Symmetry: C6
Subunit: 136 residues, 6 copies
C-alpha cells in the first residue's frame, strides 16, 4: 500500500504522439505511436503458509501483470527483424522500471521477471502475451 | 443484522458536488467530485468450525468489501504526487468509519484492515483495487 | 410437495399501491409502495446421509430463499433512521409468515432464521442482501 | 433407445386451446390454456459401478426431467385454493404417464417420483420448480 | 490423422432437397428434407494410463460425437409412429457408416455405439439427444 | 523469449491472393486462397516438478497451438479426395516450420507433433481441429 510513490516515476508518458488514449483487442493498423500497452491477466492467492498472518486474515497476495508490445516498425508483414531485436533494450527498460523498481518494501516483494517470459505471435502483424509477476 | 444503526453515521454524503449519482467502470474524466466510490468484490463462506452453530445452519459468514479512489487532483497524467499522498489521511478516515466502526457486536466481527491493502494503477489516470474484509 | 396450502395465507398482497408488479435491480426512486421484494439466491444439495433414502434417489434438498427491503421512508439519503428501525417488527413478520410457518411437515423442515442474517447497504439509498434458509 | 414406442401415448395434446405453441420464462398472463409446460434441468453421470459395462464405455446415464404447472384458475392473486388442490390428481396423472410408464426396459429404469418433489412460488401468480428423475 | 480417407464415403449427401444447408436449434417446421443433422457435444481426455506415451505428450484422446434426427414424417403431433420405427434401420445405417467404419487404425479405435444411446423428446414435434463415442 | 528470431522465417505469407486478412468461424465459401488459418486452443501449466525453479516463481509453461486447414480444392461436397491427400505434404511442411523449428533453446522445448493429431469434419465442406503442443 505504498507503490504510488514510485509508480509516479515508473510512468513517464512513453508515447509522444498518443494523447489521452486510456491504454491500459489492439488495432495494429492505426496506432499513432508505440505505447507501453500494459495488460492484466489475473491474480494469485494462497494461505496456510508464511504469507498468512494473525489478525485481519490478510496474506502476501500474488499479483499478475503483463504488457503488450506494439512497434510495427521494420516489421509490417516483412519479417520479425526490428520488432523484438530493437525491443530487447526496450523490454529490459520496461521490465526494470514498471517492475522490480519498488519503494522501501517489507512485505511487498514486487517480483520481477527478466527472462522466462515467452511470447507468441498471431494476427499477422504482432502479438506478445507477456507473463510477469507482481506479488503486490 | 444490526449494522444500519451505525451505517447511518458511516455514510455522510462525502461528495459536495455529486448529487444522486448512485455511486456504489469509472469515468476519470468528467466526475464532478471525489466521491467514496465503494465497490463489491465477493464473499467468504465456511463451515465445520466455530463459525457454524446448531439450529438454522448459519455460520459467521465472511464478507468482502472494497472501495475505489477517485481524486485526479494534482495527478492528471503528471505524477502520483497528491493522488495518494493526500489520500493517506482520507484512506484512514474511510477505512476507520466505513469499516472497524461497528455497533455492539457479539458474532459480527466487522473486520478492518488498516494496512496490507495493495493497489495498482492503470488506464493512465488512477486505479485502486482496494482489498478489505467485512466478515458481516 | 404441500407448501401451497399455507403459502396461500403466507402471501397477502403486502403493497397497497403496487398492482401487477410481478415483484419476485430495484429502482429505489419510483417504487409506488414498499412491497415484499422477495429474491432468490441458490440451492443446497447433498447425499450420503440421513437426507438420502432408498428408491427414487431423492434426499432432503436444501433450499435458499431471501428477500429485499424497500422502504425509503424516513431514509432518503438522510440517515438510517426509520429504514430498519421500523422494519424490525416488519422483518419479524416477514420471516415468521413467509418462513417458519409450514403445514403438517414430516420431511419438509422449512427452516427459518430469526437472527444471524446480516445485510449491507449500497447504491446510496438502501440495500439488504438477506440470507435465509428454506430446506424445501 | 426405445422410449418413443410409449412416448407416443405419453403425449396426448394436453391443451385444447393452445395450438403449435412449442411448449417444451412463462407468461402467466396471456396463456390460452393450461398446457403441460415441461422443463429441462440437467443430467446425471457416473462410472466405476454397475452402471458401467465393458465395450462402448457406456453406463446407465442419469437423466433429469421436470415440469412447470400453469393453471391460474381460481388462483389469480387471490389465494392458493384450486391451483394445486385441483392439480393433485393432475400432478399424479402427469407423473404417472410422462414418467414411470416405460416400455419393456432392461437397462432403462425410467425412475419416477410420486412424492418428495417440493415446489416454491414466486412472481406473484404461480411457480412450480418440479424435481423428477428420468434415468434414461 | 487418417479419417478423411473413409470420411469421403461416410458422407454421401443424405438429403436430396436440402442444398448448401451447412447442417452440422432445429426448425422442425420448414426443413426441406430429413438431413443427417449431426451435432457436437464435447470431448474426453485423460493421462496416466496406456493412452499416454513418451515424447509429444499425446494420448488416445476421447472424442464425443452425436446426431439429431429430423423426420417429421408420419409424426406431426399425431403419435410417435413412423418417427423412430422407420428410423431404426436408418439409425443403424447412420451409426455404422458415420461411426465404426474406420480405415486401417492402430491407435484410432473409432468407438461405435449400436445400443445404449437413449433419446428424449421435447418441443412437441421431435427431439433426439443422441450419445455416441468417437475416441478419435 | 527468443522465438521471433525464427518466427520471422516461420511465417512466409502463405496465401498469394489473401491480403491483409488478419487470419489468426471460417467462411468456407468465399475465401480467396488457402491460407494457413492458425487457431488458438488454450494453455498448460504446472508446478512442483523440474519445470519450477527458484526465484521468479516461473516454470516451463505448457503452451497450446493449433491450425485450421482451408483448401476446398477437389473437395466441394464431392468427396474427401484432394482435401487432405494433397495436404499431407503441406501438413508436414506446416508442422515442421511453424513448430519444431526453434532457435537455440535451453528451457524452450518447442514441442512438435508429427502424428497423433486427429481431425474431424463438419459443416459439410471441411473442418480440421488440429491438436499440437508448443510448450513455449
Amino acid at each position: 500500500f505504498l507503490e504510488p510513490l514510485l509508480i509516479e516515476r515508473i510512468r513517464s508518458e512513453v508515447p509522444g504522439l498518443a494523447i489521452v488514449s486510456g491504454v491500459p483487442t489492439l488495432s495494429e493498423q492505426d496506432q499513432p505511436a508505440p505505447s507501453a500497452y500494459v495488460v492484466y491477466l489475473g491474480d494469485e492467492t494462497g494461505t496456510g503458509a508464511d504469507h498468512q498472518g494473525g489478525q485481519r486474515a490478510i496474506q502476501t497476495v500474488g499479483q499478475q501483470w503483463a504488457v503488450v508490445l506494439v512497434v510495427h516498425y521494420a516489421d509490417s508483414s516483412n519479417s520479425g527483424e526490428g520488432a523484438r531485436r530493437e525491443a530487447g533494450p526496450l523490454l529490459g527498460r520496461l521490465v526494470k522500471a514498471l517492475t522490480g523498481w519498488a519503494p522501501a518494501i517489507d512485505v511487498a516483494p514486487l517480483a520481477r521477471s527478466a527472462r522466462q517470459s515467452p511470447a507468441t505471435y498471431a494476427s499477422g502483424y504482432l502479438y506478445f502475451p507477456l507473463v510477469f509477476t507482481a506479488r503486490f
